């Protein structure tokens, strides 16, 4: 099932974006009132668009994890149709970190990566391949919890066997996670900067990998490199990534850089 919500229990308060299917709002939901994100289906939709739009909520409704965006419910009996999710105060991860450049501890950044990895582990253990994992598709709440969203072709986030041979697996999601680690540790820099998609694919085949971010711990960058192994069977699983990041968090000197020992 999917909880069906009566439109009188929703208040749209502010437009916060333009989605694939229509406008997206911040609002409130009566259940004590809770802040929500509200995706609407624009009037004048094709049957395919209506099916696609409501399919997102079908997938999302199958999952319940602290690092996966919560579906509160849908409005499908009234118009416009709406998908109601938990509101995430700090928005998209890549934009959040760019606005906060240099303002987090390395422990805090690794903790965000730990949450993302835990959400992805849950997805993989439910045999869900995401295929579109990127910092723009992760949301951050006011307590800095990061949650995967976007349940429904960007070359530089995709594993080469998925580009060349359309082999999308949890292992290719792991490649994407590596790129996400690099987005996080650079505070939202664009992967491969403005190299062309062709130059990106060419460099990866020749063995180029993204370079170490400034002040990135050695174990974190080497974990990225392991996620970017050309042969997908040599990549860590998400269960391994979660276990590795927990060890680093528990030995936090492993995360320190020079400024932690000087000005
Ligand atoms: C977009 O900007 C924000 C969104 C915020 N919150 C928020 N919370 C939930 C959602 C969204 N946005 C949002 C806003 C606009 C758009 Cl177009 C989409 C969404 C999404 C969303 C996403 F960010 C990525 C992928 C899929 C999404 O919907 C499923 N999911 C729901 C908060 C702050 C900001 C900000 O920049 O200050």
Asked how this structure was determined, the answer is: X-ray
| Among 96, 84, 115, 110, CA closest to 219 | 110
Atom of ligand 1 nearest to the CA of 152: 29
Annotation marks residue 132 as catalytic: yes
The reply to whether 131 and 211 lie within a common domain is yes
The reply to whether 97 and 112 lie within a common domain is yes
The reply to whether 49 and 122 lie within a common domain is no
Any ligand 1 atom below 6 A from CB of 38: no
Any ligand 1 atom below 6 A from CB of 24: yes
Any ligand 1 atom below 6 A from CB of 152: no
89: tokens are: 């105060």
The reply to whether 173 and 51 lie within a common domain is no
Residues 240 and 121 sit within 8 Å (Cβ to Cβ) = no
Omega within 30 of 0 (cis) for the link into 80 = yes
CA of 164 to the centre of ligand 1 (A): 31
The reply to whether 211 and 174 lie within a common domain is yes
The neighbour count for residue 159, using CB atoms within 10 Å, is 27
Any ligand 1 atom below 6 A from CB of 19: yes
DSSP string, 199-212: HHHHHHHTT--PPP
Residues 21 and 45 sit within 8 Å (Cβ to Cβ) = yes
The reply to whether 16 and 144 lie within a common domain is no
The reply to whether 101 and 184 lie within a common domain is yes
R_g of the chain computed on alpha carbons? 19
Quote the CA–CA distance of 113 and 106 in Å, as a whole number. 11
The DSSP element (H or E) to which 13 belongs, if any, is: strand 10-18
Q: 3-class DSSP state for residue 163?
A: helix
Please say which residue of 88, 105, 122 terminates a domain.
Answer: 88
The reply to whether 84 and 200 lie within a common domain is no
| Catalytic residue from among 94, 101, 132, 150 | 132
221: tokens are: 């960058």
**Domain membership of residue 69 as a residue range:** 1-88
CATH number of residue 123's parent domain: 1.10.510.10
Nearest-CA residue for atom 4 of ligand 1:
91
| Among 92, 191, 95, 73, CA closest to 149 | 92
104: tokens are: 């987090």
| Among 82, 88, 27, CA closest to 54 | 82
What's the gap between Cα 164 and its chain centre?
Answer: 23
Atom of ligand 1 nearest to the CA of 18: 17
The reply to whether 256 and 147 lie within a common domain is yes
The reply to whether 149 and 241 lie within a common domain is yes
The reply to whether 121 and 239 lie within a common domain is yes
Please say which residue of 65, 88, 111 terminates a domain.
Answer: 88
How many domains are there within the chain? 2
CA of 170 to the centre of ligand 1 (A): 25
CATH number of residue 4's parent domain: 3.30.200.20
| Among 232, 257, 225, 227, CA closest to 242 | 227
Please say which residue of 34, 69, 88 terminates a domain.
Answer: 88
| Among 121, 110, 209, CA closest to 173 | 121
The reply to whether 173 and 71 lie within a common domain is no
Place of tokens 């999710």: 85
134: tokens are: 């990127």
């Amino acid at each position: 099932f999917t909880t069906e919500i009566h439109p009188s229990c929703v208040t749209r308060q502010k437009v916060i974006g333009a989605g694939e299917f229509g406008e997206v709002y911040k609002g409130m939901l009566k259940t004590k009132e809770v802040p929500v994100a509200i995706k609407t289906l624009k009037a004048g939709y094709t049957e395919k668009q209506r099916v696609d739009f409501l399919g997102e909520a079908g997938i999302m409704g199958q999952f319940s994890h602290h690092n996966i965006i919560r579906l509160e419910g849908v409005i499908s009996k009234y118009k416009p149709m709406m998908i109601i999710t938990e509101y995430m105060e700090n928005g998209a991860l890549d934009k959040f970190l760019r606005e906060k450049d240099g303002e987090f501890s390395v422990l805090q950044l690794v903790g965000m990566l730990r949450g993302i990895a835990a959400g992805m582990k849950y997805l993989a253990n439910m045999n869900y391949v995401h295929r579109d994992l990127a910092a723009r598709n992760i949301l951050v709440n006011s307590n800095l919890v990061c949650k995967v969203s976007d349940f429904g072709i960007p070359i530089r986030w995709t594993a080469p066997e998925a580009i060349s041979y359309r082999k999308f697996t949890s292992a290719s999601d792991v490649w994407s996670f590596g790129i996400v680690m690099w987005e996080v540790m650079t505070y939202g820099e664009r992967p491969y900067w403005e190299l062309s998609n062709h130059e990106v694919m060419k460099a990866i085949n020749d063995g180029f990998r993204l370079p170490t971010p400034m002040d990135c711990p050695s174990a974190i960058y080497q974990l990225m490199m392991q996620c970017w192994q050309q042969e997908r069977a040599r990549r860590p699983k998400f269960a391994d990534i979660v276990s590795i990041l927990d060890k680093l968090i528990r030995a936090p000197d492993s995360l320190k850089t020079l400024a932690d020992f000087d000005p």
